[PDB]
Design a protein around this nucleic acid. Structure first.
Ligand SMILES: [K+]
Ligand SMILES: [K+]
Ligand SMILES: [K+]
Ligand SMILES: [Mg+2]
Ligand SMILES: [Mg+2]
Ligand SMILES: [Mg+2]
Ligand SMILES: [Mg+2]
Ligand SMILES: [Mg+2]
Ligand SMILES: [Mg+2]
Ligand SMILES: [Mg+2]
Ligand SMILES: [Mg+2]
Ligand SMILES: [Mg+2]
Length: 60
RNA sequence: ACAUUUAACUAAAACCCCUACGCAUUUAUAUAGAGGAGACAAGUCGUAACAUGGUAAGUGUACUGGAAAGUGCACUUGGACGAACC
């Protein structure tokens, strides 16, 4: 069954470390879909204010 | 509500009421639902305060606004006015 994957930047500390790290994780799953030849369909994508990700949703 | 009797050549016998409490009063627990306060985050919106915080802040009171808060009158310094003259 297909997976609707969602990543959210947890509110645990100051700065954009949580939001910046979310972008890296989201790119990791997107690249992992290509490695497994999986179709990666973007559903939601809300970038942060410092080149990061607040929350993102995608379908694999 | 309720009666002084019997007996008395030594002296004794007899004596025995019925009405209250209604889930009425008093104090708590449990709550359909409606809110508050503290803790917490960093999410969302703005930047009110702390420097003359960029409208100096605040008190009382009134009205208004998503939200801090905004404005009127009076008061306070828990602000300043640069401290000879020019
Ligand atoms: K908040
Ligand atoms: K003010
Ligand atoms: K002040
Ligand atoms: Mg209740
Ligand atoms: Mg301000
Ligand atoms: Mg001024
Ligand atoms: Mg201003
Ligand atoms: Mg001000
Ligand atoms: Mg005032
Ligand atoms: Mg007031
Ligand atoms: Mg006004
Ligand atoms: Mg006016």
């Amino acid at each position: 069954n297909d997976v609707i994957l969602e990543v959210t930047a947890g509110r645990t500390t100051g700065g954009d470390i949580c939001q910046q790290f979310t972008r890296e994780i989201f790119d990791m799953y997107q690249n992992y879909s290509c490695y497994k030849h999986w179709q990666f369909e973007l559903l939601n994508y809300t970038p942060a204010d410092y080149g990061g990700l607040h929350h993102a949703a995608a379908r694999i």
